[PDB]
Amino acid sequence: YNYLYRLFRKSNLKPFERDISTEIYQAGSTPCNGVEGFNCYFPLQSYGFQ
Amino acid sequence: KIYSKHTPINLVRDLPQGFSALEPLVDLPIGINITRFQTLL
Numbered sequence: 001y002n003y004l005y006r007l008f009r010k011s012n013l014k015p016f017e018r019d020i021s022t023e024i025y026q027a028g029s030t031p032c033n034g035v036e037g038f039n040c041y042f043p044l045q046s047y048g049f050q
Numbered sequence: 051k052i053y054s055k056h057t058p059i060n061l062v063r064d065l066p067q068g069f070s071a072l073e074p075l076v077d078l079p080i081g082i083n084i085t086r087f088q089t090l091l
């Protein structure tokens with residue numbers, strides 16, 4: 001699980017754009033206020049290579 | 051990227067109406083994003 005990819009963003013990366021920022025992704029009308037919930041999710045996922 | 055020029059002047063109030071082209075000093079592969087800046091003195 002040391003290897004991860006971003007699953008959510010407001011808009012696509014431009015050519016060679018890099019974006020570490022760890023903000024919890026608000027998908028819906030309800031804000032995250034720093035934690036997951038109703039239509040709100042952590043920005044990354046992992047391949048979990050087996 | 052960065053460019054510059056220097057010149058002597060006589061008028062003190064604001065920029066002297068004339069022409070003199072700026073030449074490059076630096077290019078960097080920064081990747082970082084700029085939206086704001088400030089002067090240091």
Ligand SMILES: *[C@@H]1O[C@H](CO)[C@@H](O)[C@H](O)[C@H]1NC(C)=O
Nearest residue numbers: 010011014017082083084085
């Ligand atoms: C710079 O960063 C902001 C987020 O802080 C982003 O919204 C904006 O689109 C970026 N600007 C450029 C020119 O990529």
